[PDB]
Design a protein around this nucleic acid. Structure first.
Lengths: 492, 50, 105, 157
RNA sequence: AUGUUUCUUCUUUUUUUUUUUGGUGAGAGG
RNA sequence: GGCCGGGAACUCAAAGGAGACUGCCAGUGAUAAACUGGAGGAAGGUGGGGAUGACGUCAAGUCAUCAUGGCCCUUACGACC
RNA sequence: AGAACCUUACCUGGUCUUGACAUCCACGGAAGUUUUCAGAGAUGAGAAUGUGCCUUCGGGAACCGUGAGACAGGUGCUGCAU
C-alpha cells in the first residue's frame, strides 16, 4: 500500500529515466480529471500525492483570479485572502473533498497519463539523444501502407511517416519490410505523425555518401552541392582540402563499389560525381559530364550561361527529357542554355546586330562606330549611360567630349524610351483604365505597364502569381486589385 | 503493476482494480415510487430513514 | 560542468582536470576546426620547422615571416620581418584581420 | 583506379634478447597507366598488412611524367644509389621489356615501347626510387620548348 | 688457463542459417 | 558447574558498508612534480601480509595424471595369483 | 599427502590365452545362495537347490560361460612429435 507507491515510483524512475516529480504531477492531474468526471457539475479539482506514503488528498480547487468568469472553478483574490492571507493570483483554494477510490477506472486513467508523460519525457529524451538520427538515415519497419503515405515503426513507440512525394517513383513496400530514410523534419503536432522521413530529397543522397565514404564522415571530403531526379539520376559536387586525395576517386571507390552501393539503395539511380571548382565556368563544365563542352559564355546580369557543344554531343548534353542540363543547372545554381557552336555564333551575331541597330537608332552614330562599341563589349544603352568614364576612354578613337556626348545621348534615349513606355500606358492607357482600379497609384500603374499590363482588362486577366514580383505589391493587395478590375470589366 | 502499486496506495480502500457495485438496477419500465417499506430484524441498528 | 565527481573518487577527477586543462590550452579552440585546413600561418620557422615540412607534403600553401637566421628551404611565402616584438606582430595580425574581415563575406 | 601491382617480399629481423622477430619489408607500385606514377614503402610483422600500409603513401606519392603517346621523351639517366639504369628510347618499338623487378613497375605507367639495362648492382630497392627519378627530370618536348630558345616551334621544326 | 661435431623455422584463404438462476405444482395466452 | 533467572550494556559470532587521499600546514625546490617533518586518528605514506607470475629465454621437465602421430608386442613386451 | 599383502609398473615360480576391463554376434545358464576342497594362492575339481517383473505370452534388458571374432590391453619408445 504505502511502500508500494515508493516501489512503483522507483521502478518507473529507473526504467524510463524520468524525474519522479514529473510522474507525480501527471498522476495528480489524472486523478483531478477522474474526480471532475464523477460530479454532474463542472468543478475545479486539485489532487496532491504525498511523496513518502503515496497517500493523496483531493480538493475543490478555486483558481484565485482578479475577475471571476466561472464561479464554479474561480474565486476572487479578496475572497481567497479571507480564508488564507498568504494566497496570490494564480494559487488554489481547497475544500475537504472525498478522494476518488482508486478503482480500475482511475487506474486506467493513471496508466494513460503515465504513458503520455513517458512519451513527453523518456521518448522525448531518446529523440534528443538520437540528434544524429534526427537528420541521418533512420531505419524503420513498415507498419502500414496507405495510398498517400507509409507508416514506419522505429521502435520504442516512435512512428514515422514517408509521404508519397518523399518515396522513390518505383518503390513498392509491404508491411514488415525494412526501409532506410533521412529524418528531414520533426513536428511537435498534437495529432498525426511527428517524424517525417524522405527517400526522394537530396539529403538522402548526401547521408548515404557520408555512410559509404569514410573520407566524407571524417570531413576530409566535403559535398558542396547535390542535384537529384529521384529514382532516375543524381549529380553530386565534391571538394577536398587535401591535395593527396582524389575526391571523385574516393566517392567512386574500388571499381565503383561505393557509388554502386548508394545506387542500389536508391533503386538503381544513376549517380554522377563531379569535382567542385571555385570558378563557375569550370564547375559547369564538370557538372555537364559526360558531355564535352566546347565553349561557355557567361551572362552575369541574367545569371545565365550559354554552353556550346559539338553537334554530336548536343543530345548527350541535354540528356533524356533535358535531365542532364536540368541537374547541372540545379547543381550550379545557374540557368544553362545548351546549343551547338554554330547556333552560339548565330546567336552572338544576332545580338551584335540588334545592339548595333539599337545604338544606330538611339545614339545617332554610324554603323562603323556602333560596331566598335559592340566589339569593346557594350550591348545595352544602360551600360553606355552608367559605366565608368575610364572604360569608355580606353576605346580607341573616343575623346572625353565624345564620351560625354555619347553618355548624354544614351541617358536621353533611356529617358525617351521610359517616357514612350509611360505614354504607351501610364499617361493615357494606365492613367485612366488601370488607374480606375481603386488602390493603383501612378508608380504601381507604371510598374504594371512595364510588365505589359497596360489596361484594366489586362489586369483583370492576371493571376496573383503573375504580379508577385512587383516591388510594393503584396499577394493580398494584388488579389484585391485583380478583383476590383474584374468587378469593373466583367460585372459593370 | 506500477500503477497498481499506486492503486494500492491512496484509495486502496478501493480493494485493487475495484468496481464496488451498489444495487445498480436494470431497465424496461418507468414509474413513480409511491411507497417504501423497511423491515428490520431485531438487534440491527436502525438507520436514519428507518 | 554538471557531474564528473559523483561517478568515481574525488582524487581521480583532479587528474582529469589536469588532463582536461593541459589538453585545453594545447588543443586550443581548434576542436571545431575542419580537421585539415586550407592554409596555416607561420610566425617563425626556427623550431616550428616541422610544420612547414608537414604543410608542404599535402600541397597546402602556408606563409612565413623570415628573420636573419632561418632558411627558405621549404616555406612558400618568405616575408621579412623581426620575430621579436609585441605590438608589431599584432600590427601584422591587425593587417591580416583586415583581410579576414573580407574573409567572411 | 589505383591499378595495384605488388612484387616484393623478404624477411628482416631485429635480434633482441628475446630473439629475432621477422618483420616483412614488402614493396609495390601504384599508378593510372596514363601518366601518374608513385609508390609507397611498407613493412609489418606479416605479409598482408605490409602491402596495405604501403598503399597510403602511394596515394600521396603519385608524380606525373607528361606521358607522350604512352612512352618516354628522350634517353635519361636513372642513376641512383646502387643502380645506374638508362632509359633508352624506342619510339613505338612495340616491346615492353625493362629490368627485373622494374618491368612490373613499368606496367603501371602504361607504356609499350622502351629499352633499359640496370647498370651496376642488381638491387630491387634502388630501382623504384630511380625509375621515378629517371622519369621525374624527364620532360616532354613542350616544357623544354617552354624554357630553351624562347621559340616553341623552332625546336619542333 | 680451457669449453667438439653434424641440427631448426615462418607467414595472404577458408567459412549456413530457421521452424511444423434448476426442479416441482397451479393458472393463462396462441 | 554463567549452573538456574535476568540483560541487549559488553567480549565474542557473522553480514552491507562507513575509514586513507599526500586530504591539510610549513620549509625547500623550475607557480609542477616531490621528499620528509606538524596534526588528529585504529592505522601515514603500495597501514602488515597473501593472491595475480608481461613479452619472452632455457627449442628447461614430464608420454609414469589424462589426451594423442608413428613404432613394436598383440599364444606377448598384454593378463592373474 | 605416508614402501607388511596392497600400492608395484620390477623379480622367482606356477598359469589362460579372444583375455583383468568394453561393445556387439549365436545359443545356453536364469539371476541368486551357503559350504566341502588338489592347491602357497591362483585357478580349477564338486554337492545341495532357486526362479522378481513385463507377458507383442513363435520370449527380452540387468549377470556369466564356451566358440569366431572386429578389437581390447600398452607404466613399452620418442618431451627435440605436439
Amino acid at each position: 500500500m504505502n511502500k508500494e507507491i515508493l516501489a512503483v515510483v522507483e521502478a518507473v524512475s529507473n526504467e524510463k529515466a524520468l524525474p519522479r516529480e514529473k510522474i507525480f504531477e501527471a498522476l495528480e492531474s489524472a486523478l483531478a480529471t477522474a474526480t471532475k468526471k464523477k460530479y454532474e457539475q463542472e468543478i475545479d479539482v486539485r489532487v496532491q500525492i504525498d511523496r513518502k506514503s503515496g497517500d493523496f488528498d483531493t480538493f475543490r480547487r478555486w483558481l484565485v483570479v482578479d475577475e471571476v468568469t466561472q464561479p464554479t472553478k474561480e474565486i476572487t483574490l479578496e475572497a481567497a485572502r479571507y480564508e488564507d492571507e498568504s494566497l496570490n493570483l494564480g494559487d488554489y483554494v481547497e475544500d475537504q473533498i472525498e478522494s476518488v477510490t482508486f478503482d480500475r477506472i482511475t487506474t486506467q486513467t493513471a496508466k494513460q497519463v503515465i504513458v503520455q508523460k513517458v512519451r513527453e519525457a523518456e521518448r522525448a529524451m531518446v529523440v534528443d539523444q538520437f540528434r544524429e538520427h534526427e537528420g541521418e538515415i533512420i531505419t524503420g519497419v513498415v507498419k502500414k501502407v496507405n495510398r498517400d503515405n507509409i507508416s514506419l515503426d522505429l521502435g520504442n513507440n516512435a512512428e514515422a511517416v514517408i509521404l508519397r512525394e518523399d518515396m522513390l517513383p518505383r518503390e513498392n513496400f509491404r508491411p514488415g519490410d525494412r526501409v532506410r530514410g533521412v529524418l528531414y523534419s520533426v513536428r511537435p503536432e498534437a495529432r498525426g505523425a511527428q517524424l517525417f522521413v524522405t527517400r526522394s530529397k537530396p539529403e538522402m543522397l548526401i547521408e548515404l555518401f557520408r555512410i559509404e565514404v569514410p573520407e566524407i564522415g571524417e570531413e576530409v571530403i566535403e559535398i558542396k552541392a547535390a542535384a537529384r531526379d529521384p529514382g532516375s539520376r543524381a549529380k553530386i559536387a565534391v571538394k577536398t582540402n587535401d591535395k593527396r586525395i582524389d575526391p571523385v576517386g574516393a566517392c567512386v571507390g574500388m571499381r565503383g563499389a561505393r557509388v554502386q552501393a548508394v545506387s542500389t539503395e536508391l533503386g538503381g539511380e544513376r549517380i554522377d560525381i563531379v569535382l567542385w571548382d571555385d570558378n563557375p565556368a569550370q564547375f559547369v563544365i564538370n557538372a555537364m559530364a559526360p558531355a564535352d563542352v566546347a565553349s561557355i559564355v557567361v551572362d552575369e546580369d541574367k545569371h545565365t550561361m550559354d554552353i556550346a557543344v559539338e553537334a554530336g554531343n548536343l543530345a548527350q548534353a541535354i540528356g533524356r527529357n533535358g535531365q542532364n542540363v536540368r541537374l547541372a543547372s540545379q547543381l550550379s545554381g545557374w540557368e544553362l542554355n545548351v546549343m551547338t557552336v554554330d547556333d552560339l555564333q548565330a546567336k552572338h551575331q544576332a545580338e551584335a546586330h540588334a545592339a548595333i541597330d539599337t545604338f544606330t537608332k538611339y545614339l545617332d552614330i554610324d554603323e562603323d562606330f556602333a560596331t566598335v562599341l559592340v566589339e569593346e563589349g557594350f550591348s545595352t544603352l544602360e551600360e553606355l549611360a552608367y559605366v565608368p568614364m575610364k572604360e569608355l576612354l580606353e576605346i580607341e578613337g573616343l575623346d572625353e567630349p565624345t564620351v560625354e556626348a555619347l553618355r548624354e545621348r544614351a541617358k536621353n534615349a533611356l529617358a525617351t524610351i521610359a517616357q514612350a513606355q509611360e505614354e504607351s500606358l501610364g499617361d493615357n492607357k494606365p492613367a485612366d483604365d488601370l488607374l480606375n482600379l481603386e488602390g493603383v497609384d501612378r508608380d504601381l500603374a507604371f510598374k504594371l505597364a512595364a510588365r505589359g499590363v497596360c489596361t484594366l482588362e489586362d489586369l483583370a486577366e492576371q493571376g496573383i502569381d503573375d504580379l508577385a514580383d512587383i516591388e510594393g505589391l503584396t499577394d493580398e493587395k494584388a488579389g484585391a486589385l485583380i478583383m476590383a478590375a474584374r468587378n469593373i470589366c466583367w460585372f459593370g | 503493476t506500477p500503477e497498481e502499486k499506486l492503486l494500492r496506495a491512496i484509495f486502496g480502500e478501493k480493494a485493487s482494480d475495484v468496481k464496488d457495485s451498489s444495487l445498480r438496477v436494470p431497465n424496461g419500465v418507468s414509474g413513480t415510487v409511491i411507497d417504501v417499506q423497511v423491515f428490520t430484524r431485531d438487534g440491527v441498528e436502525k438507520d436514519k430513514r428507518a | 560542468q554538471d557531474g564528473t565527481f559523483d561517478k568515481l573518487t574525488k582524487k581521480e577527477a583532479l587528474m582529469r582536470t589536469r588532463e582536461l586543462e593541459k589538453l585545453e590550452n594545447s588543443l586550443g579552440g581548434i576542436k571545431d576546426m575542419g580537421g585539415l585546413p586550407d592554409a596555416l600561418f607561420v610566425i617563425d620557422a626556427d623550431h616550428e620547422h616541422i610544420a612547414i615540412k608537414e604543410a608542404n607534403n599535402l600541397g597546402i600553401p602556408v606563409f612565413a615571416i623570415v628573420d636573419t637566421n632561418s632558411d627558405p628551404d621549404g616555406v612558400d611565402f618568405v616575408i621579412p620581418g623581426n620575430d621579436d616584438a609585441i605590438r608589431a606582430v599584432t600590427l601584422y595580425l591587425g593587417a591580416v584581420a583586415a583581410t579576414v574581415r573580407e574573409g567572411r563575406s | 583506379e589505383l591499378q595495384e601491382k605488388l612484387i616484393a617480399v623478404n624477411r628482416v629481423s631485429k635480434t633482441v634478447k628475446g630473439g629475432r622477430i621477422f618483420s616483412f619489408t614488402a614493396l609495390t607500385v601504384v599508378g593510372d597507366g596514363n601518366g601518374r606514377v608513385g609508390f609507397g614503402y611498407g613493412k609489418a610483422r606479416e605479409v598482408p598488412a605490409a602491402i596495405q600500409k604501403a598503399m597510403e603513401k602511394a596515394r600521396r606519392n603519385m608524380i606525373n611524367v607528361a606521358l607522350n603517346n604512352g612512352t618516354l621523351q628522350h634517353p635519361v639517366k636513372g642513376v641512383h644509389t646502387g643502380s645506374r639504369v638508362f632509359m633508352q628510347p624506342a619510339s613505338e618499338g612495340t616491346g615492353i621489356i625493362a629490368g627485373g623487378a622494374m618491368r612490373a613497375v613499368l606496367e603501371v605507367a602504361g607504356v609499350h615501347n622502351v629499352l633499359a639495362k640496370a647498370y651496376g648492382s642488381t638491387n630491387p630497392i634502388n630501382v623504384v626510387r630511380a625509375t621515378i627519378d629517371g622519369l621525374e627530370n624527364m620532360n616532354s618536348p613542350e616544357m623544354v620548348a617552354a624554357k630553351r630558345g624562347k621559340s616553341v616551334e623552332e625546336i619542333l621544326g
